[PDB]
Design a protein around this nucleic acid. Sequence first.
DNA 1: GGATTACACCCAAGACACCAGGCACGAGACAGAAA
Length: 49
Amino acid sequence: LMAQVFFGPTYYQRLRHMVDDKIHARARGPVQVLTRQPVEGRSRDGGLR
DNA sequence: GGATTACACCCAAGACACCAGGCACGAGACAGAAA
């Protein structure tokens, strides 16, 4: 490489936010009883606002 | 006095008519009583 590279060990930490705990998709599913709109929440297979 | 103060998303945790008191149906036990 034409440019030299800064290089060495550094202390890194893994945070709790992982993509597989955030990915969510919905085509159709449960709806609220009062308004008949998609429910809220990824855990409940909800929709996006 | 009244009304309103960004958007979206995640998760977890604790509460949601309880109750008590007066009225009914059925039953059964221990004591009455003739023999």
